[PDB]
Amino acid sequence: SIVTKSIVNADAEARYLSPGELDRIKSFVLSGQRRLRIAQTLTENRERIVKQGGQQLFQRRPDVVSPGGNAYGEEMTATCLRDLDYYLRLVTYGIIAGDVTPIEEIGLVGVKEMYSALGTPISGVAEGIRCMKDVACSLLSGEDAAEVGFYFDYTLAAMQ
């Protein structure tokens, strides 16, 4: 949350929120009705984003679903697509919070040591996040897509 992240920056320096930090929190709450409409555009398009984003992934990385890959089998490919739904849900949390804090604490902290324990290619999960960003950003306008595009951009770099 933009509010929580600005308080821990002030509490660390033992001070009050500066007028520049308070001015950012003001336009964060006033733009809440517009940011709630961007998160609901993705919430009503899960079937298209997770199905298309997962179909595009298996064409750029066919070896993860081929016999011998991590996501091989009916139940294993389903868990594969289950994870793209976990990360699309967190991106809607971050659009509403105004910060990458919900994505970081749920599904980015300890994610590399996690996937390495299951034997999952971390670069195959970043490829599926880049393919969901292609579907999701095509549902939005010029602005309101750069906003959605950032939370997909951070999840890529932070995951690698």
Partner: protein
């Protein structure tokens, strides 16, 4: 080890800067304790009274000595914050005597102060997040000023 509570890029430049021999063990420890990883781990969830007992534990290997020390660090954490706290520990004369610029701090079983032995043993014998108790909240007031 940081693998379970970091994303992976918070203290990556401090590591590369140390392996090149550019910074000493004392600079790598000051730069490591005043990072976003330490602030998120040992400053946000706890009050300043518990942040003092953890700061001496990690950077000095011992619990707080006496009341004059608790009220000295408490005034730093009220005015200047966390990063001025870490500088007062690493730049102290006690640090330079026992750890210098080439050693990493250790558990440091103490003897001489009145309760520093049993207090330092309660800090280092408890596991991380074992409970939310403050070991040395303060010293019971001795008569006088």
């Amino acid at each position: 080890d940081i693998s379970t509570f970091v994303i992976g890029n918070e203290i990556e430049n401090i590591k590369i800067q140390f392996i090149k021999g550019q910074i000493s063990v004392k600079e790598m420890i000051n730069a490591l304790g005043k990072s976003s990883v330490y602030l998120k781990e040992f400053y946000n969830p706890y009050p300043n009274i518990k942040v003092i007992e953890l700061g001496t534990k990690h950077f000095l290997g011992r619990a707080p000595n006496n009341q004059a020390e608790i009220r000295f660090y408490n005034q730093i954490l009220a005015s200047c914050g966390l990063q001025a706290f870490i500088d007062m520990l690493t730049n102290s004369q006690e640090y330079a005597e026992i750890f210098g610029e080439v050693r990493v701090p250790f558990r440091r079983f103490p003897t001489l102060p009145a309760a520093n032995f049993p207090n330092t043993n309660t800090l280092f014998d408890k596991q991380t997040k074992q409970n939310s108790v403050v070991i040395v909240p303060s010293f019971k007031a001795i008569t006088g000023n």
